[PDB]
């Protein structure tokens, strides 16, 4: 732990003809395990991790049924939202939804979440206690009233606290060889001279999993954030992640600077010097 299961759904309307383009992806932690793409020929939920291929045809039948139903919910939503916001049929609009559950190291439920956006802006989301809704504007307040009367939060809370967690546990066990393995960052430092008086030190972390990591610089043992650049953590494409952090230093003073790396896969925090 900790661990999580999350599903992400995107529907984009197609003015002029036919249904929205719908893409659904499921993750356990930072590992995608299933996907559905309305533009794909199979029209089935497809495996994306070898451990989910253990599941039988009944699982796949069921997930395909549910995800296609999800797609129709978004299709109807796009039309409704166009009405709420008094928009024309001319433009493409998007709905996004994400939900999922987090468990701690003991694999017990920690938190659940369910959030919805229209055209990239908050629309409605379950509150932290999974018992009520946060509606961003009057259109979403109309939806909140509807979902209150239909007891949607109660259904979702039951799922998030029960089924979501139970299935996360199942996946963690079935996929133990990779899901429960941590890959510590492989680190090194590079050096470049911009001019006679200024150098850049870059501290690299490669090949790590999960994606959560902290990379920081110190100067003479004290936190250094000025004259640093930290790139967004990025996927390697083989399941692992990469990140780097750089600092600009006076040439000849490189020895004052140290990079510090924290990650789940490192029992002791790590230090690099030039």
């Amino acid at each position: 732990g900790s661990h999580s299961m999350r599903y992400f759904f995107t529907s984009v309307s197609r003015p002029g003809r036919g249904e929205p383009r719908f893409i659904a992806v499921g993750y356990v932690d930072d590992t995608q395990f299933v996907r559905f793409d309305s533009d794909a020929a199979s029209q089935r939920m497809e495996p994306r991790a070898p451990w989910i291929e253990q599941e039988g045809p009944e699982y796949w039948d069921g997930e395909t049924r549910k995800v296609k139903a999800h797609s129709q919910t978004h299709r109807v939503d796009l039309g409704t939202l166009r009405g709420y916001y008094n928009q024309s049929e001319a433009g493409s609009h998007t709905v996004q939804r994400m939900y999922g559950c987090d468990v701690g190291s003991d694999w017990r439920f920690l938190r659940g979440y369910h959030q919805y956006a229209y055209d990239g802006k908050d629309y409605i989301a379950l509150k932290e206690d999974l018992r009520s809704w946060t509606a961003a504007d009057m259109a979403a307040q109309t939806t909140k009233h509807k979902w209150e009367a239909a007891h949607v939060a109660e259904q979702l809370r039951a799922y998030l606290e029960g089924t979501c967690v139970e299935w996360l546990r199942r996946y963690l066990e079935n996929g133990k060889e990779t899901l429960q393995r941590t890959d510590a960052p492989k680190t090194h430092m590079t050096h470049h001279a911009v001019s006679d008086h200024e150098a850049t030190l870059r501290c690299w972390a490669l090949s790590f999993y999960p994606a959560e990591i902290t990379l920081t610089w110190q100067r003479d043992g004290e936190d250094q954030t000025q004259d640093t650049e930290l790139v967004e953590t990025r996927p390697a494409g083989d399941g692992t992640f990469q990140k780097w952090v750089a600092v600009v230093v006076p040439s000849g003073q490189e020895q004052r600077y140290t990079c510090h790396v924290q990650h789940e896969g490192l029992p002791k925090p790590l230090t690099l010097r030039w």
Partner: peptide, 9 residues
């Protein structure tokens, strides 16, 4: 394992 949605906005 997906939740049944079905509640439209």
């Amino acid at each position: 394992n997906l939740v049944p949605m079905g509640a439209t906005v």
